[PDB]
Amino acid sequence: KPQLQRLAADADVDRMCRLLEEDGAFILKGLLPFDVVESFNRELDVQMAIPPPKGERLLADPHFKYVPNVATTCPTFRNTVLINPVIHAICEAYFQRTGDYWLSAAFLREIESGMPAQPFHRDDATHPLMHYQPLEAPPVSLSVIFPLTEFTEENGATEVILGSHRWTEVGTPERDQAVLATMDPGDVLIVRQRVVHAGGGNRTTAGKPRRVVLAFFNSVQLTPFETYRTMPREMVESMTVLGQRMLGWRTMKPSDPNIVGINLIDDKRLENVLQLKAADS
Amino acid sequence: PQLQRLAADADVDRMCRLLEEDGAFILKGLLPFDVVESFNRELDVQMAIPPPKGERLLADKYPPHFKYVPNVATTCPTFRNTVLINPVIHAICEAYFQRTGDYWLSAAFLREIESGMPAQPFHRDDATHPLMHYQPLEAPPVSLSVIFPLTEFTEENGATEVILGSHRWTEVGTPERDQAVLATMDPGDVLIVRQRVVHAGGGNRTTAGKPRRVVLAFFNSVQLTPFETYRTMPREMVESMTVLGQRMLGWRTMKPSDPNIVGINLIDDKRLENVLQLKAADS
Ligand SMILES: [Fe+3]
Ligand SMILES: [Fe+3]
Numbered sequence: 001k002p003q004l005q006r007l008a009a010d011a012d013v014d015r016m017c018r019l020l021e022e023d024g025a026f027i028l029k030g031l032l033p034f035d036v037v038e039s040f041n042r043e044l045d046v047q048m049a050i051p052p053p054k055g056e057r058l059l060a061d062p063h064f065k066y067v068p069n070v071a072t073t074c075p076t077f078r079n080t081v082l083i084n085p086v087i088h089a090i091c092e093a094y095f096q097r098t099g100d101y102w103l104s105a106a107f108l109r110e111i112e113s114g115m116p117a118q119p120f121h122r123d124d125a126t127h128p129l130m131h132y133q134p135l136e137a138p139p140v141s142l143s144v145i146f147p148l149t150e151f152t153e154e155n156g157a158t159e160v161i162l163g164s165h166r167w168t169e170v171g172t173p174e175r176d177q178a179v180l181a182t183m184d185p186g187d188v189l190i191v192r193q194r195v196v197h198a199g200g201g202n203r204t205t206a207g208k209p210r211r212v213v214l215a216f217f218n219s220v221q222l223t224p225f226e227t228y229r230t231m232p233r234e235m236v237e238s239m240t241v242l243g244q245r246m247l248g249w250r251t252m253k254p255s256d257p258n259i260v261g262i263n264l265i266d267d268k269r270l271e272n273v274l275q276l277k278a279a280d281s
Numbered sequence: 282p283q284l285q286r287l288a289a290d291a292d293v294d295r296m297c298r299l300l301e302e303d304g305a306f307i308l309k310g311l312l313p314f315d316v317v318e319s320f321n322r323e324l325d326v327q328m329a330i331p332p333p334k335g336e337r338l339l340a341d342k343y344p345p346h347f348k349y350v351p352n353v354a355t356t357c358p359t360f361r362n363t364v365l366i367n368p369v370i371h372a373i374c375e376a377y378f379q380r381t382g383d384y385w386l387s388a389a390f391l392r393e394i395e396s397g398m399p400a401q402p403f404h405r406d407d408a409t410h411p412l413m414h415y416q417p418l419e420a421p422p423v424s425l426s427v428i429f430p431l432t433e434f435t436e437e438n439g440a441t442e443v444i445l446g447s448h449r450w451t452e453v454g455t456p457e458r459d460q461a462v463l464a465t466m467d468p469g470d471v472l473i474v475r476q477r478v479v480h481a482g483g484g485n486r487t488t489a490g491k492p493r494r495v496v497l498a499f500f501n502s503v504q505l506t507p508f509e510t511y512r513t514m515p516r517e518m519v520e521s522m523t524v525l526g527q528r529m530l531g532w533r534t535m536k537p538s539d540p541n542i543v544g545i546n547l548i549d550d551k552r553l554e555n556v557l558q559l560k561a562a563d564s
Binding site for chain 2: 053055056057059068124125127128137138140220221222223227230254255259260261263264266269270273274
């Protein structure tokens with residue numbers, strides 16, 4: 001059975017665009033260097049060791065290891081991963097027809113041993129209107145998936161069904177229709193909108209849990225799952241322009257027919273109203 | 282067949298159906314005179330202020346006669362404290378968005394059509410979020426146009442031209458203007474227009490007098506990014522609004538329908554309003 005294509009991180013972007021439309025997913029080898037993976041990994045270690053908050057936990061409410069909006073608490077992600085050029089070439093190619101995109105969410109998941117796999121699904125629950133968008137419409141969401149442990153047959157490599165974005169419905173596909181996204185930390189799995197998939201769970205009996213970071217880039221038309229308006233100003237101005245843009249701190253622009261933009265106020269750009277500085281401005 | 286006019290106390294089920302059938306209707310005398318009146322007074326203060334000389338994203342694209350006050354919620358207490366939380370408007374919205382879930386205010390701004398501007402083309406309110414163009418008619422609606430005449434609407438001053446049922450058309454095309462019926466209203470009335478209905482601003486034939494004045498509010502599914510972002514309102518202003526008002530303007534976590542079980546516009550796995558420890562006049 002045809003497997004997921006592995007690609008060198010410096011591969012030409014049009015093949016990745018091509019692959020997204022043909023297979024619906026692909027893998028980049030060694031996009032993030034080891035030291036970058038290492039820092040992010042110890043930054044996330046801090047948040048995991050931070051005691052549990054007592055209020056309500058909207059998504060956490062058995063054992064659900066999970067760090068939300070890692071961009072506010074993980075400098076490596078905020079300052080390096082989020083702005084990674086290869087990622088954004090893909091995005092610009094992919095969001096060609098829809099226009100500006102930004103970060104709807106990026107959060108950590110750990111999968112303990114002996115957890116059942118996911119059921120096959122499409123990433124269309126956060127914005128259910130996507131369920132009704134036809135395949136031909138301009139895509140408005142892109143799943144980017146960072147392994148931070150080994151992804152193996154054993155621990156539950158992500159399962160993808162290639163080409164399945166062409167289906168009208170998910171239905172009940174069989175596990176042996178999927179292929180495995182086995183990768184090493186530093187690699188990245190990129191999944192097109194409408195592609196059917198499932199996390200593998202974890203069938204190790206005893207051992208370290210599989211750790212994945214899930215990033216969702218959507219058209220700026222879609223409301224971000226996580227709002228970054230509470231980030232302190234000084235933290236925001238320490239980011240590059242592109243980083244500020246991805247986190248909803250600037251005015252954006254869906255493609256024409258929208259000739260004006262979005263996320264604006266007083267008929268001005270938000271960043272100008274806020275007198276916003278940036279690492280690279 | 283003309284747009285049906287209904288009393289403000291009309292039954293909501295009947296209104297919802299009219300949106301499926303006709304696509305638009307009108308509420309007569311929804312806002313009392315004092316509300317219309319003081320809303321107008323607050324507007325004239327903004328019209329008295331010369332437009333900025335910085336960049337102006339929407340105005341600059343129009344000619345230098347564009348009369349426009351953006352996001353009136355930030356400068357018109359009457360809209361922010363009364364009109365925007367109107368019980369009838371929200372009874373309609375709760376029904377219209379039943380299948381998509383929580384909604385909020387993408388935009389609410391002022392237009393003034395001076396004497397002598399020609400007819401606006403027949404369009405649909407689907408340019409801000411073009412993804413709306415591709416949704417099937419069967420999909421849960423995600424956007425709703427609420428139209429507030431602040432002056433008299435008549436055929437001479439270009440009452441809104443609406444084409445009933447035109448949401449079921451596959452294309453817009455280029456229809457001629459006698460296919461449309463007119464939304465002649467008095468101030469205090471409201472024109473409710475469903476997603477995908479074809480319509481146009483008529484223009485202004487009058488040679489003198491007051492420009493036709495309208496406030497257009499767009500209630501969208503919370504899945505859709507608000508056009509106007511109200512995150513720069515001073516906190517004190519926000520906390521003097523009702524909870525509902527705060528939800529309308531993005532200051533609280535909202536919830537799209539299932540299969541979204543979590544919500545949207547939250548942070549630290551918590552509700553935005555709780556992270557902010559945000560009070561409200563009725564909290
Ligand atoms: Fe998924
Ligand atoms: Fe319109």
